[PDB]
Design a protein around this nucleic acid. Structure first.
Ligand SMILES: [Mg+2]
Ligand SMILES: [Zn+2]
Ligand SMILES: [Zn+2]
Ligand SMILES: [Zn+2]
Lengths: 47, 419, 505, 115, 52, 78, 66, 258
RNA sequence: UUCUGUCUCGUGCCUGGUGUA
């Protein structure tokens, strides 16, 4: 039940971008965005 | 389009480049004296090949302008440094003038396949087929010309304790034994990034492509993959472990709907590093996904030296199993001695000897080819001051029985590259 | 005439001396992917029965069940237990396993021995491991080579491969009636060092080397030296390796030609003249002359006397026992093998300087027209022949002087007299002098107008002006002769690139 | 992809015998001891200790394939003393040697610190 | 089937304390792809615990 | 009144073991006591060595004639 | 990229010595005396600090994708 | 036939290394004891890392690897902990592991050095070697980067992964002078004297000794800081003694199992 | 003396470039 948070490019500020939305940052209008790290379990052997 | 190169001018048997220029040039940080002033003062000149047929060229002033019985006595130019005849990949080779020329050519070819940090902004680039070492190192023995190649800042390889010995038969026929314990410690560990690009489109009046988690109740043509790994976005999340036939981008094209998703290439097995979403020239949604994969060096990986010594890892032994010196030094890579005699890569041996002096003296050794002030005997005299056999050999103890092996093994730091 | 085939795999090849010469170490993933249809039959129904239960997931499992009506049941989907049942007429496509016959190829399939058949042995780490001696047939070094594995899919085909193309059946080639597989590369150096007259082993070391003979009958030979301490000779252990009762006479590489004439004919001072009688080594040192791929070699006799199986074992034993002793002896190469004691360097320098003076005198004679044109040749051609003769004499004499200065422990000599890798010319070039660099058979041409480089003066026919490299690879090459060495070496690369397309056609 | 997990050099599977003895057929009084999941750390000491036994005619070991976790020690003794007991004793007292070493090292350590 | 695609932790045997997602599951054994290693091992389902 | 060679060519031996093994895999009766091996190739080989394989080799000659040779009539090489 | 935690050949910890080595080099120590000060006697360990290039300092020049 | 009588003599004992000499022991026993020092000596090392959040320039596996290689003070807990695979508890517990936590965020303007001082531990006896000198640099962080992770250190030994190797360098050596000619020098006078050479500067190598076994095995066991260097040697001896006791058990059973 | 599970092998191609043995 997440609105699908993305990280802006030149801003680095979390924006909520739903499907059928143009990828534009809420501020400055930059078009490059990155998905935030997963919430799933991340475990490594440290080997 | 005329290819030409700079040369020093010689008016009588004397260079036009006097100490005042070197002194001003040495200060070029404070005062901005530079190459332009050297050219403008008429000390340097760009000679072209067609013009070079009529210039009489010395190689080094300090010997070819004095005389015993005059050879030329009318030089017009002088080489800056004869090592400037090499290119970019050919000038990272230490002691190339001690190697058979095909070996130099093969190293020039392989120097473009050696992994390392290929650029400092590699975490920003969504490049296809990117490889970066965990711990690349500056070579212990360098040419003076690799400073301009900036190889010291973006190197591709690791200095490894190479023991050129026929050990237990797997370091055989161009292969190399590696130290499993060294690998565990990250020796030659690299990460491989693969990038997947995908864009949505208006296929037509009737058909449209969109990123969505495919669902079997609506999508036909689905496969056995776990689409649930995708979030509602339809794009895999950064930090999620993926494997062969896993869906990466859930694209669906309406007809109810056909599953037109893009899947990870078969047998890749990586972890999603980052996912970027944007718009292309056409203003449609477009996303580049980069998947990282840690590649621990295993058996069959091709490792090469800076002298043309390509070889696959034949087997990996634990440190308990590797041969060891009077102290706990085991080789990181054991290379077959039969690689040297026919290929005559003596520059390899000279590197393995000077790297030893470099690691003991605490200075990066100089292996510029036409030095004439750096010969094997002087290196050996240096090496014997540090309590070593002057030729680089050592008394190795067999790792399996602990008994000394009757032949003293040639061993020393050598800059090895991972292809 | 050429198709793409199912049931085929390709991987980087890597060495493995512990495999029999007729074995290939396939990785686990390939063995788990490729399948062999085995007909269900009472002799094996239970073995396959449980094998089928294992399914596609576990490695020693199966992938499909083909019913007699052709209905294939896919085991990758864990079907209902009723479908897993198999009866006499069905086929189980089990995974590849140890002992399965495979036919192994390298793509430049130049001759019949490029597609020899091997028995599979599954091993970890993703590579096709193969015995060292099989390198020569495939011409497949391990610097990154890849080879194709084809799995036969029927008994009638496996049988045909096993009885026609199996590796030991391919030891001798009809091309030249000699063997094509021999003791080669490292183990030839080790066996030369091992079969010297002065190699002695304790009870503790022999009782460990005999552990690696498969065909050993288990009785330790009476040691050639009993007192003051039990000592076995290298040749004594090596006699245990030679199969059956072979009888041949071969000569070691360093055998003096004038030894068979004088005294000490049957008792050689230098331990040359290999003599194997009644399956025992009586004298001599082994090298490529007696263990290599040559007519009349010891392995050739073993194949012609014994079957192809006993010779298969003879190969594996030589490799395992000699490589096990190489952990004690050890072998290397380094800078100490290139240094020439500073006495031979004086001879090298004097010879090169005298040769340069001779070339200068020939040039003076030519410039003064005192040089008479020899028959057939022109004046300029006779001059070039004269200079090439002088410089060839210089290079050869300096190399020969280098040979005699090398100590018996020199590792270049150990690798040259064994025949494993290298030639005396490589020692000459590394230690004494590199020599003349030729392009298309002539000295370096006047690329510029009447000279080879801007560093030389016009019309300079001297040694270093036309390509004669007077330094050794240890002393380094002057920049002009560095570039000339590059020009000379470029010819080898060009010929390699163009020859392949002409010869393949 | 085909990397064996490192534990396979020492962890016992289902069914694996730690040691398996088989009589050797080619000679009297000779057995083959096959240790599973072991290497040269155990092979060199047992081989050498077997050689101190004046009743041991032959003693040595091999690792049939280095990527196979199996080693083979072979022992053959005089007919009046089975290889089994030769092995047993050479370990019976090898354990004593290591205990004797433990005791002697422990005292040498306590003697070095403030001594 | 039932727990395919769930995140499981291995609680017994040589792979103890390993995290992986399930890619196949039978009545007795399941195939777990390990998060750390580039491998997909077959393990007995009684050795697995579900973390989600 | 046969003229071909009385020895079994390596090809004949190979194709005989191949075909006979396949017949054994299809459980045609085996001509010799199985001590308990189950690989059809090993059984076919045992038969051959005992000379009990029930196959005759029809050797075609270039002119068009042929000569039937029982596997028990000619001599095995290996 | 970052100084290795342990020397690849022997295993001596050298990850805690890069900053110290930089400080010694900030003083006029020759890298050979610097290495002796840090207690690196074997050439395998000395190779770690002599050949290490700290690229993480370059990677930190980029603003993070917070 | 029976056991020989070994001796020991410690010549130097520091908190970093031990130099000792073993007499009256076999060549194999002295090398097997060396091998145990490298491979078969248990220590505590991080073998499980749950990365909650990582935004540093170093990747998740990079961080994990580096954490795995950090030496932990394993002196009393390691001989008491149960191997994780052998432990009956689900997941981890104090009986089979030492929990570690590292939650770090850089907010100050200057770059943060994430050393091993940030690795908090659930136990006071098992910590990175920081007791009493700089710390192992794990990451460098810019303003706004963070690293939050949970880790567990398991009891393991160097045969499985190099992380569990307690030694920095083991200098095994015997017969300094070439009395047994176990190694043959092409030119014996080009070779520097060993540290233990009971030889004057005149002669090169000791005269050949035909009847002579190797004794007086010189060791220099250097620790990585995990185990005290003398405890590494004691841990080898107890572990090898156990290996032989257990092997004799399995052997004796296999004899009766006929 | 109300029912209801019903899902099982989808796929571009040409051309050019670089690289491996
Ligand atoms: Mg090759
Ligand atoms: Zn913005
Ligand atoms: Zn080190
Ligand atoms: Zn527990």
């Amino acid at each position: 039940q997440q609105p699908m948070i993305y990280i802006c490019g030149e801003c680095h500020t979390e924006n909520e971008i739903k499907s059928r939305d143009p990828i534009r940052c809420r501020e400055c209008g930059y078009r490059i965005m990155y998905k935030k790290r997963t919430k799933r379990l991340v475990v490594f052997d440290a080997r | 389009g005329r290819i030409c190169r700079p040369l020093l001018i010689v008016e009588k048997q004397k260079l036009l480049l006097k100490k005042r220029h070197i002194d001003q040039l040495k200060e070029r940080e404070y005062n901005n004296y530079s190459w332009q002033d050297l050219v403008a003062s008429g000390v340097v000149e760009y000679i072209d090949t067609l013009e070079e047929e009529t210039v009489m060229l010395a190689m080094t002033p300090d010997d070819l302008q004095e005389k015993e019985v005059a050879y030329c006595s009318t030089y017009t130019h002088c080489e800056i440094h004869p090592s400037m005849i090499l290119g970019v990949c050919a000038s990272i080779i230490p002691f190339p003038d001690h190697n058979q020329s095909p070996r130099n050519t093969y190293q020039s070819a392989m120097g473009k396949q050696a992994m390392g940090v290929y650029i400092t902004n590699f975490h920003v680039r969504m490049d296809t087929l990117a490889h970066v070492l965990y711990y690349p190192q500056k070579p212990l023995v360098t040419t003076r010309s690799m400073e301009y190649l900036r190889f010291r800042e973006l190197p591709a390889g690791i200095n490894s304790i190479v023991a050129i010995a026929s050990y237990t038969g797997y370091n055989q026929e161009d292969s190399v034994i590696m130290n499993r314990s060294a690998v565990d410690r990250g020796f030659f560990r690299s990460v491989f990034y693969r990038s997947y690009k995908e864009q949505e489109s208006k296929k037509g009046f009737d058909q449209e492509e969109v990123f969505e988690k495919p669902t079997r109740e609506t999508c036909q043509g689905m496969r056995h993959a776990i689409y649930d790994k995708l979030d509602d976005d339809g794009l895999i999340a950064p930090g999620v472990r993926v494997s062969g036939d896993d869906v990466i981008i859930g694209k669906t094209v309406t007809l109810t709907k056909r599953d037109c998703s893009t899947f990870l290439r078969t047998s890749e097995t990586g972890i999603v590093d980052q996912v970027m979403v944007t718009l292309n020239q056409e203003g449609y949604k477009f996303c580049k996904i980069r998947v990282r994969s840690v590649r621990i060096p295993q058996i069959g990986d091709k490792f090469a030296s800076r002298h043309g010594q390509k070889g696959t890892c034949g087997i990996q032994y634990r440190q308990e199993d590797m041969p060891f010196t009077c102290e706990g030094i085991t080789p990181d890579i054991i290379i077959n001695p039969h690689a040297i005699p026919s290929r005559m890569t003596i520059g390899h041996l000279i590197e393995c000897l000077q790297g030893k002096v470099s690691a003991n003296k605490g200075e990066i050794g100089d292996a510029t080819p036409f030095n004439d002030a750096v010969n094997v005997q002087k290196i050996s005299n240096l090496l014997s001051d540090y309590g070593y056999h002057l030729r680089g050999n050592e008394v190795l103890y067999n790792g399996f029985t602990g008994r000394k092996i009757t032949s003293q093994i040639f061993i020393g730091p050598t800059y090895y590259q991972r292809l | 005439m050429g198709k793409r085939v199912d049931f085929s795999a390709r991987t980087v090849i890597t060495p493995d001396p512990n495999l029999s010469i007729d074995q290939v170490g396939v990785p686990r993933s390939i063995a788990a992917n490729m399948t062999f249809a085995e007909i269900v039959t009472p002799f094996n129904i239970d073995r396959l029965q449980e094998l089928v239960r294992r399914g596609n997931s576990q490695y020693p499992g199966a992938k499909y069940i083909i019913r007699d009506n052709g209905d294939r049941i896919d085991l990758r989907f864990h079907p209902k237990p009723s479908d897993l049942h198999l009866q006499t007429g069905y086929k189980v496509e089990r995974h590849m396993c140890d002992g399965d016959i495979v036919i192994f190829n390298r793509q430049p399939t130049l001759h019949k021995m490029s597609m020899m058949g091997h028995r599979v042995r599954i091993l970890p780490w993703s590579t096709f491991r193969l015995n060292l001696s099989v390198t020569t047939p495939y011409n497949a070094d391990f610097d990154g080579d890849e080879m194709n594995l084809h799995l036969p899919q029927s008994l009638e085909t496996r049988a045909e491969i096993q009885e026609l193309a199996m590796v030991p059946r391919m030891i001798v080639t009809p091309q030249s009636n000699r063997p094509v597989m021999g003791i080669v590369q490292d183990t030839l150096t080790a066996v030369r060092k091992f079969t010297k007259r002065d190699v002695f082993l304790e009870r503790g070391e022999v009782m460990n080397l005999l552990m690696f003979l498969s065909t050993w009958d288990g009785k330790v030979p009476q040691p050639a030296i009993l007192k003051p301490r039990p000592l076995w000779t290298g040749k004594q252990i090596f006699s245990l390796i030679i199969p059956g009762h072979i009888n041949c006479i071969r000569t070691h590489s360093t055998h003096p030609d004038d030894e068979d004439s004088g005294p000490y004919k049957h008792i050689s001072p230098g331990d040359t003249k290999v003599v194997v009688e009644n399956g025992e080594l009586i004298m001599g040192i082994l090298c490529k002359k007696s263990l290599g791929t040559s007519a009349g070699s010891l392995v050739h006799i073993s194949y012609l006397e014994m079957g192809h199986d006993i010779t298969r074992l003879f190969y594996s034993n030589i490799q395992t026992v000699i490589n096990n002793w190489l952990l004690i002896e050890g072998h290397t190469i380094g800078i100490g093998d290139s240094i020439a004691d500073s006495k031979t360097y004086q001879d090298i320098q004097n010879t090169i300087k005298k040769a340069k003076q001779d070339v200068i005198e020939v040039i003076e004679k030519a410039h003064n027209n005192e040089l008479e044109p020899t028959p057939g040749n022109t004046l300029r051609q006779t001059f070039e022949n004269q200079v090439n003769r002088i410089l060839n004499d210089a290079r050869d004499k300096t190399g020969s002087s280098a040979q005699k200065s090398l100590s018996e422990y020199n590792n270049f000599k150990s690798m040259v007299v064994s025949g494993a890798k290298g030639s005396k010319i490589n020692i000459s070039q590394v230690i004494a002098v590199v020599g003349q660099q030729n392009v298309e058979g002539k000295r370096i041409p006047f690329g510029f107008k009447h000279r080879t480089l801007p560093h030389f003066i016009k019309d300079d026919y001297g040694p270093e002006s036309r390509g004669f490299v007077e330094n050794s690879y240890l002393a380094g090459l002057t920049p002009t002769e560095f570039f000339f060495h590059a020009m000379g070496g470029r010819e080898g690369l060009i010929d390699t690139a163009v020859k392949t397309a002409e010869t393949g056609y | 992809m085909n990397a064996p997990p490192a534990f396979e050099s020492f962890l016992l599977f289902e069914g694996e015998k730690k040691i398996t003895i088989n009589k050797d057929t080619k000679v009297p009084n000779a057995c083959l001891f096959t240790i599973n999941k072991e290497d040269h750390t155990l092979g060199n000491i047992i081989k050498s200790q077997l050689l101190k036994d004046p009743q041991v005619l032959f003693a040595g070991y091999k690792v049939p394939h280095p990527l196979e976790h199996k080693i083979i020690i072979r022992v053959q003794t005089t007919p009046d003393y089975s290889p089994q007991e030769a092995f047993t004793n050479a370990i019976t007292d090898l354990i004593s040697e290591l205990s004797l070493l433990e005791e002697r090292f422990r005292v040498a350590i306590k003697d070095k610190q403030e001594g | 089937n039932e727990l395919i695609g769930q995140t499981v932790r291995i609680s017994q045997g040589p792979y103890k304390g390993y995290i992986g997602v399930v890619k196949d599951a039978t009545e007795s054994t399941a195939r777990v792809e390990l998060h750390s290693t580039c491998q997909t091992i077959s393990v007995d389902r009684q050795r697995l615990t579900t973390v989600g | 009144k046969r003229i071909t060679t009385p020895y079994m060519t390596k090809y004949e031996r190979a194709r005989v073991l191949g075909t006979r093994a396949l017949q054994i895999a299809m459980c045609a009766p085996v001509m010799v006591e199985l001590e308990g091996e189950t690989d059809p190739l090993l059984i076919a080989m045992k038969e051959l060595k005992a000379r009990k394989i029930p196959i005759i080799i029809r050797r075609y000659l270039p002119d068009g004639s042929y000569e039937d040779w029982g596997v028990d009539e000619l001599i095995i090489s290996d | 990229m970052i100084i290795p935690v342990r020397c690849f050949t022997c295993g001596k910890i050298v990850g805690n010595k890069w900053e110290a080595y930089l400080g010694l080099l900030q003083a006029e120590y020759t890298e050979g005396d610097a290495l002796d000060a840090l207690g690196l006697k074997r050439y395998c360990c000395r190779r770690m600090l002599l050949a290490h290039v700290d690229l993480i300092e370059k990677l930190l020049n980029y603003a993070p994708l917070e | 036939p029976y056991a020989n009588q070994p001796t020991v003599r410690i010549t130097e004992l520091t908190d970093e290394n031990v130099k000792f000499i073993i007499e009256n022991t076999d060549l194999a026993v002295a090398n097997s004891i060396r091998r145990v020092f490298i491979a078969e000596v248990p220590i505590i090392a991080i073998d499980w890392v749950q990365i909650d959040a990582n935004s540093s320039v170093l990747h998740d596996e990079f961080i994990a690897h580096r954490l795995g290689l950090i030496p932990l003070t394993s002196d009393d807990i390691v001989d008491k902990l149960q191997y994780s695979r052998d432990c009956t508890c689900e997941e981890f517990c104090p009986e089979c592991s030492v929990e570690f936590t590292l939650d770090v965020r850089c907010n100050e303007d200057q770059t943060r050095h994430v050393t091993s001082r940030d690795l908090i531990s659930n136990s006071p006896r098992v910590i990175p070697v920081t007791s009493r000198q700089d710390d192992i640099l794990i990451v460098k962080l810019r303003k706004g980067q963070e690293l939050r992770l949970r880790a567990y250190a398991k009891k393991g030994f160097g045969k499985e992964h190099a992380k569990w190797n307690p030694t920095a360098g083991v200098a095994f050596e015997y017969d300094p002078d070439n009395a047994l000619r176990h190694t043959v020098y092409p030119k014996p006078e080009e070779w520097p004297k060993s540290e233990y050479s009971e030889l004057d500067e005149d002669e090169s190598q000791a005269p050949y000794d035909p009847n002579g076994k190797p004794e007086r095995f010189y060791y220099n066991v250097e620790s990585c800081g995990s185990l005290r260097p003398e405890t590494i040697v004691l841990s080898a001896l107890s572990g090898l003694k156990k290996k032989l006791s257990d092997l004799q058990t399995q052997l004796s059973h296999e004899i009766q199992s006929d």
